[PDB]
């Protein structure tokens, strides 16, 4: 009852927790796979143009 | 108690949705980012030489 709450609460408590810190992972590994790709997309483009010269 | 617990379970849910979903997006972007290196590194090494 009361304490199967409490115990229920607490238990929610952690889920919420571990899901902040796994979407907080998420979106700091697709925010630096972005910044790569961007990297990457110049990268190329420069390297096509050095190809050609 | 029952109503907190199944509201829990609903975000829970709700949550490991969104987990999958960026985890999938973010497994593509690796993939993508992985061989954008390994051609962006050939091409160098081979306009170097």
């Given at each position: 009852?009361?304490?199967?709450k409490?115990?229920?609460?607490?238990?929610?408590?952690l889920?919420?927790?571990?899901?902040?810190?796994?979407?907080?992972?998420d979106?700091?590994?697709?925010?630096?796979?972005?910044?790569?790709?961007?990297?990457?997309?110049?990268?190329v483009?420069?390297?096509?143009?050095?190809?050609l010269?």
């Open positions: 009852e009361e304490g199967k409490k115990f229920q609460r607490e238990i929610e408590s889920t919420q927790q571990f899901e902040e810190k796994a979407a907080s992972y979106k700091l590994e697709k925010t630096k796979n972005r910044l790569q790709q961007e990297l990457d997309d110049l990268v483009d420069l390297d096509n143009q050095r190809q010269v």
